[PDB]
Design a protein around this nucleic acid. Structure first.
Ligand SMILES: [Mg+2]
Ligand SMILES: [Mg+2]
Ligand SMILES: [Mg+2]
Ligand SMILES: [Mg+2]
Ligand SMILES: [Mg+2]
Ligand SMILES: [Mg+2]
Ligand SMILES: [Mg+2]
Ligand SMILES: [Mg+2]
Ligand SMILES: [Mg+2]
Ligand SMILES: [Mg+2]
Ligand SMILES: [Mg+2]
Ligand SMILES: [Mg+2]
Ligand SMILES: [Mg+2]
Ligand SMILES: [Mg+2]
Ligand SMILES: [Mg+2]
Ligand SMILES: [Mg+2]
Ligand SMILES: [Mg+2]
Ligand SMILES: [Mg+2]
Ligand SMILES: [Mg+2]
Ligand SMILES: [Mg+2]
Ligand SMILES: [Mg+2]
Ligand SMILES: [Mg+2]
Ligand SMILES: [Mg+2]
Ligand SMILES: [Mg+2]
Ligand SMILES: [Mg+2]
Ligand SMILES: [Mg+2]
Ligand SMILES: [Mg+2]
Ligand SMILES: [Mg+2]
Ligand SMILES: [Mg+2]
Ligand SMILES: [Mg+2]
Ligand SMILES: [Mg+2]
Ligand SMILES: [Mg+2]
Ligand SMILES: [Mg+2]
Ligand SMILES: [Mg+2]
Lengths: 67, 80, 141, 55, 145, 70, 206, 63, 60, 143
RNA sequence: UAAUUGCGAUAACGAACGAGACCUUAACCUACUAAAUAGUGGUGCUAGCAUUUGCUGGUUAUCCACUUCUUAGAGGGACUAUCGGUUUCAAGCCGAUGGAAGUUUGAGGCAAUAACAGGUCUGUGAUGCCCUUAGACGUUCUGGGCCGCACGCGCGCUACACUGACGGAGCCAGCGAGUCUAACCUUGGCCGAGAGGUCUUGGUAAUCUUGUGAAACUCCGUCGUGCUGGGGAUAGAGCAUUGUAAUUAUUGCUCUUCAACGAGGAAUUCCUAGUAAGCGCAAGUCAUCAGCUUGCGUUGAUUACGUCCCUGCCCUUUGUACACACC
């Protein structure tokens, strides 16, 4: 079962909150962004974060999202 | 002779030293203290030495025949 | 120095290395022709790439393969993988792209992993059974 | 001694084979005591003063 | 091998060493229904006798059978090693025998008796109808006697 | 014991006049034709191939297989 | 077929059938059709194969089992009863032999005959042990195609093995006997019997 | 004998106490425009083909 | 990799749980052509707790 | 074309060489052959009876051709298989060092193998010669 | 959702322990740094076969170059990515493509709060109290015993054969481990049917044993359904190994003896992919003894991808005169 933990979803929230221009429905670059722009300690957790923030963006593009 | 050498060396704050603080409880109790006084003191002192958190367990038997244990934590710890 | 590539193939723990150089068309395994091989039933499995992609194809090239590891079936899959991978690696540096991609096409299409290594592997046993999932046996009382 | 042991009838296999088997052979576990496990036998009890002095 | 023929020649069932032996079995094994002739013994004896093991008990000349016996009961003479033998180093005359047929029963009797007569634990143990080679006797063999 | 371990001349001729129509012949089939056990029946397999009837279409231990001659 | 050769050379029939048609041990995959609508989709045949061996990942998903070539499913199901678990080389060879045998009798692509005994053995309907209260009656069900193929293979090989046990007839021979008797359904096969009976009771309880 | 072929069009769910049975709406083939609900025995997906042994009769629950 | 594989219990009761410790041993070699002076210098220093440094010589 | 044995499948080769060494008449057959087993791990002696020493000879030879050097130990380990310890699990067991050692000594006296340095037994150059030769012969029956 | 994992609902808002993160191991790097304790290509010295180039080897250094394969440091890599279905268009779930890899990537390590009169005083020079303390319950020495056998129960090994046993022949792993003030891992040479013996030898080890040429397995034969050549219990005689000692037979070998067992009632265990099952090996124990364990690789499936029927457990709601808490 692939459901994202709080810390991940929380981080996507905050990032999109404060860095929406930059970020872009592409994981590959949102990733690199996350590196340059926030401080995480595992590649894995950072990726998980990026990929979810990428999802969240990708669906904001078509109407707002709560939170 | 002389192919082995010993040096002593004070430790930077015994406060973040499990081993020191255990030995300290040992001594507090052995030196006839109280139970909660001893433990709460060790803890308050570890905390005061700027730790993120700490926990002291006393297990076994005091004065009453039946055995008991007690957790004495303060601050913050992670377990896994 | 003539044109030449090296490749390999891998099923379970067996690994099969291929040296694919410019030649008059040999196809040998360890030190014998690819006609010997036996397993035998499985023999066609190692012919398989050649016939998928036309027997000609190997006339500008010498092919040699050496497998260590795994066991009998294990080694057959590894060697075949190494050979097809080989041929494609060679069309990629010497022939033209379109040819190579036509070969990847006919392998990848029919397939049996020929170009891509099977990731299946041993799972470790864990105390309480003779196997990995197998648990021992209980009676209750 | 060994002369004894071979010469002694009332010994060897046939003789056992012909005897009935006791019922305590086919017995059961026993158990004895368990729903007393939580029930202290010591009859002693502690006491709130001694416990409060201790802990 | 080859499509064969013969006539009345081969007679089914034939009797050697005071026992009986079926025809229509591959001879080497026929010899086995005698006591004291495990598959090896039979094999080597037949090879020593100069016989075609491809034959049944079936065929075989009378002569052939005779030789077979001769060697069977005089192994040491017709160069059979002696480590090949069920009774080396007697325990009285110390010769090496390959005791055969109705006689191996006797020899067992003899040995067991010697043990019993000397009061040796192995003997007592035999007399008692128990296991003698030291195996635990709590759990195994209870169907028994 | 229950029979088919020799050759009884009548049996041989029987083998020669019974082996057509046998689209399948093998060790098993020969036994099934109420005769030759898998010893001498194997010999029969080798010796119908001496010349004639049986056409070898498969190979080995356990499995043999032949068809009527043409 | 235009022969060609190089250093270490490749045998005649080998070159021949190899490059041309893509056929079996050496049997046709073209022609060969599934005489019962449905079952197509659950009996493979094309893509064609050389021998029924494959490092197949046919388990990790619910239905992809279907996509595994039928003949290889049969051989797979051959290699059981403890002693034989694993032992696919054994099985595969037993199949090569079986197909040769089946071919001998009545022609047909023997792989077509196999296809037929498979079509002809899956129960069109069956039963399950519904409660309905302690004394459990039996509710007739119509069974899936997938279950039909599965159970067909199961039955065929079981009966073939049980037959083959303790007699001179060899596995491939009795497997071919079951296959043949079943391909055009003849109540002398263990399989056809078991199907017919399953459906007898399944009628009997609707 | 009258065979009747029907195509699974919708998978409804599992019935049976044990829960290995599956309720399905099928559109029979030799003349659509008519639907019936049967109970399976095997694993089933959208577009499979059942041989309804008897053409008109249908179930629901299963304990 | 040195494995030691032991029962967790000091006694016998309980489902039979097993546990397995390891000590990982890492080994390396660097070959160097030099005179006496630099070897002696470089090897008296570079000293380190936990790292076992051995210097040999020769070609046999 | 040119030839080795590696160009010839195990069985028909080793049987070709069996029949050869056989024919030849030069050999050495210890004498204990026929009365002997091949390994403690076995039940019955070989079925080839007269021969099989030629079979192992061939086999051994080809095995040594196909590599640097090999000793008696490695052959025992090779020629050995599973022994039923009856009712207690099977275990691999080495075969007899007599059979093998004697075989080596035989092929050597016949100059088809030679005590190697490094250890063991290296194929002889005249071994190379004669083996490549019958290999060739075996592909020649197949023509 | 595997998860008090999240979405959402919302008198709550925002957090911390635990789950997750983290760590280890298995997977991917013709990118980085390298290597006679790992290997490849060229070259020389050289063998054999063809001869027209060729093909297959020998040669811990005769030199040159390399790092694909092996080793282990540093990095990189995946985030359920892209697309599409489905869902309160939420968290998610599903399918397709790509991919070394998309079941928490596979498998483990760590692991909160609380509970139990669970097991351990026979691991401890951890320990309270009781007992005992010279006709010892201290200790050591000799010898026996834990193995004793009408029989009940559990874990196992080997089988009932023809997908097989036997016999030639083919012939391929991975995880380990090994001798200093000592006798450990052992190649090679001889002798021996075997077990083993004997003379030498390499290794404190990526260097030597050892490519641990393992077993199942593959191939050509023999046997042919017969308790059979399936099976190898029991037993007799002889030979060797460990050990001060082998009797109640440590173990190994040879010959011989050739049992039950013809697929196992009621019941009941285990398991979803390199898994199950088959198969061997190394390590622990160890003077000698594995039918045990712990790991390892080899061969490699059938069947689900669901449910609450059985069982077990957690959760709500509910009752309580229980709270030492239904013992
Ligand atoms: Mg945490
Ligand atoms: Mg395993
Ligand atoms: Mg006998
Ligand atoms: Mg071997
Ligand atoms: Mg062998
Ligand atoms: Mg959990
Ligand atoms: Mg030239
Ligand atoms: Mg030239
Ligand atoms: Mg590299
Ligand atoms: Mg894909
Ligand atoms: Mg991981
Ligand atoms: Mg208790
Ligand atoms: Mg303790
Ligand atoms: Mg005490
Ligand atoms: Mg201890
Ligand atoms: Mg302690
Ligand atoms: Mg005492
Ligand atoms: Mg005991
Ligand atoms: Mg019990
Ligand atoms: Mg247990
Ligand atoms: Mg064999
Ligand atoms: Mg001697
Ligand atoms: Mg030395
Ligand atoms: Mg290795
Ligand atoms: Mg019987
Ligand atoms: Mg046997
Ligand atoms: Mg004793
Ligand atoms: Mg005793
Ligand atoms: Mg018998
Ligand atoms: Mg059974
Ligand atoms: Mg002992
Ligand atoms: Mg051991
Ligand atoms: Mg134990
Ligand atoms: Mg009330």
């Amino acid at each position: 079962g692939r459901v994202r933990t709080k810390t991940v979803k929380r981080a996507s929230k905050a990032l999109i909150e404060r860095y929406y221009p930059k970020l872009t429905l592409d994981f590959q670059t949102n990733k690199r962004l996350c590196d340059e722009i926030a401080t995480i300690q595992s590649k894995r957790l950072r990726n998980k974060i990026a990929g979810y923030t990428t999802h969240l963006m990708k669906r904001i593009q078509k109407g707002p999202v709560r939170g | 002779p002389g192919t082995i050498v010993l040096y002593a060396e004070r430790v930077q704050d015994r406060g973040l030293s499990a081993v020191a603080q255990a030995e300290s409880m040992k001594f507090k109790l052995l030196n006839g203290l109280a139970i909660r006084r001893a433990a709460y003191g060790v803890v308050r002192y570890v905390m005061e030495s700027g730790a993120k958190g700490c926990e002291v367990v006393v297990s076994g038997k005091l004065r009453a025949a039946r055995a008991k244990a007690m957790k004495f934590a303060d601050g913050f710890l992670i377990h896994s | 120095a003539v044109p030449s590539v090296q490749t390999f193939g891998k099923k379970k723990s067996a690994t099969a290395v291929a040296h694919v150089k410019a030649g008059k068309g040999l196809i040998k395994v360890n030190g014998s022709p690819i006609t010997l091989v036996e397993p035998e039933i499985l023999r066609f499995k190692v012919y398989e790439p050649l016939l998928l992609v036309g027997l000609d194809k190997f006339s500008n090239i010498d092919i040699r393969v050496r497998v260590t590891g795994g066991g009998h079936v294990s080694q057959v899959y590894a060697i075949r993988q190494a050979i097809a991978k080989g041929l494609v690696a060679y069309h990629q540096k010497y022939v033209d792209e379109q040819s190579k991609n036509e070969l990847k096409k006919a392998f990848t299409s029919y397939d049996r992993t020929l170009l891509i290594a099977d990731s299946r592997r041993p799972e470790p046993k864990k105390f309480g059974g003779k196997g990995a999932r197998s648990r021992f046996q209980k009676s209750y009382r | 001694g060994n002369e004894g042991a071979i010469r002694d009838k009332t010994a060897g296999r046939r003789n056992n084979r012909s005897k009935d088997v006791t019922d305590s052979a086919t017995t059961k576990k026993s158990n004895t005591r368990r729903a007393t496990d939580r029930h202290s036998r010591t009859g002693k009890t502690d006491t709130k003063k001694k416990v409060n002095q201790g802990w | 091998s080859l499509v064969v023929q013969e006539q009345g020649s081969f007679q089914h069932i034939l009797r050697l060493l005071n026992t009986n032996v079926d025809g229509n079995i591959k001879i080497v094994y026929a010899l086995t229904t005698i006591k004291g002739v495990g598959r090896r013994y039979s094999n080597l004896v037949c090879k020593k006798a100069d016989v075609d093991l491809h034959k049944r008990a079936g065929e075989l000349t009378q002569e052939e059978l005779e030789r077979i016996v001769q060697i069977m009961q005089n192994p040491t003479h017709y160069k059979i090693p002696a480590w090949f033998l069920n009774r080396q180093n007697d325990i009285t005359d110390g010769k090496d025998y390959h005791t055969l047929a109705n006689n191996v029963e006797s020899k067992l009797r003899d040995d067991l008796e010697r043990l019993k007569k000397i009061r040796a634990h192995r003997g007592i143990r035999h007399f008692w109808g128990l296991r003698v080679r030291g195996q635990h006797t709590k759990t195994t063999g209870r169907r028994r006697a | 014991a229950q029979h088919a371990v020799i050759l009884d001349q009548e049996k041989y001729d029987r083998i020669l006049k019974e082996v057509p129509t046998y689209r399948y012949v093998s060790v098993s089939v020969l036994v099934d034709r109420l005769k030759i056990g898998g010893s001498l029946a194997r010999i029969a397999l080798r010796h119908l191939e001496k010349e004639g009837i049986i056409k070898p279409i498969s190979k080995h231990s356990k499995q043999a297989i032949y068809t009527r001659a043409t | 077929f235009t022969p060609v050769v190089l250093a270490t050379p490749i045998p005649e029939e080998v070159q021949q059938a190899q490059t041309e048609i893509k056929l079996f041990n050496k049997w046709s995959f073209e022609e060969v059709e599934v005489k019962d609508a449905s079952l197509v989709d659950y009996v493979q045949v094309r893509q064609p194969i050389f021998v029924a061996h494959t490092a197949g990942r046919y388990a990790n998903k619910r239905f992809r089992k279907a996509q595994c070539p039928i003949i290889e499913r049969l051989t797979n199901s051959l290699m059981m009863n403890g002693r034989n678990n694993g032992k696919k080389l054994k099985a595969v060879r037993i199949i090569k032999h079986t197909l040769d045998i089946i071919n001998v009798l009545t022609d047909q692509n023997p792989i077509q005959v196999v296809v037929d005994a498979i079509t002809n053995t899956g129960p069109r309907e069956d039963t399950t042990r519904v409660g309905g209260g302690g004394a459990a009656r039996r509710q007739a069900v119509d069974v899936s195609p997938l279950r039909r193929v599965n159970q067909a293979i199961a039955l065929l090989t079981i009966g073939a093995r049980e037959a083959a046990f303790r007699n001179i007839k060899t596995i491939a021979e009795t497997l071919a006997e079951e296959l043949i008797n079943a391909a055009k359904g003849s109540s002398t096969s263990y399989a056809i019997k078991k199907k017919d009976e399953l459906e007898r009771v399944a009628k009997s309880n609707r | 004998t009258p065979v009747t072929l029907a195509k699974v069009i919708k998978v409804l769910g599992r019935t049976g106490s044990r829960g290995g049975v599956t309720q399905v709406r099928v559109e029979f083939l030799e003349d659509t425009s008519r639907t019936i609900v049967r109970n399976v025995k095997g694993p089933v997906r959208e577009n499979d083909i059942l041989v309804l042994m008897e053409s008109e009769r249908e179930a629901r629950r299963l304990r | 990799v040195l494995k030691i594989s032991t029962r967790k219990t000091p006694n016998g009761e309980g489902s039979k749980t097993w546990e397995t410790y390891e000590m990982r041993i890492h080994k390396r070699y660097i070959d160097l052509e030099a005179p006496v002076q630099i070897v002696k210098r470089i090897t008296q220093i570079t000293i380190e707790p936990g790292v076992d440094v051995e210097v040999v010589v020769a070609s046999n | 074309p040119g030839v080795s044995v590696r160009d010839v499948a195990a069985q028909d080769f080793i049987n070709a060489y069996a029949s050869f060494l056989q024919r030849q008449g030069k050999l050495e057959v210890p004498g204990y052959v026929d009365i002997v087993k091949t390994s403690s791990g076995n039940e019955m002696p070989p079925q080839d009876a007269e021969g099989w020493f030629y079979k192992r000879a061939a086999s051994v030879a080809r095995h040594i051709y196909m590599r640097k050097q090999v000793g008696v130990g490695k052959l025992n380990k090779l020629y050995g298989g599973a022994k039923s310890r009856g009712v207690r699990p099977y275990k691999h067991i080495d075969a007899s060092g007599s059979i093998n050692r004697k075989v080596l000594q035989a092929l050597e006296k016949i100059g088809i193998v030679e005590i190697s340095p490094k250890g063991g037994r290296r194929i002889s150059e005249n071994g190379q010669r004669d083996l490549d030769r019958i290999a060739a012969q075996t592909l020649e029956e197949d023509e």
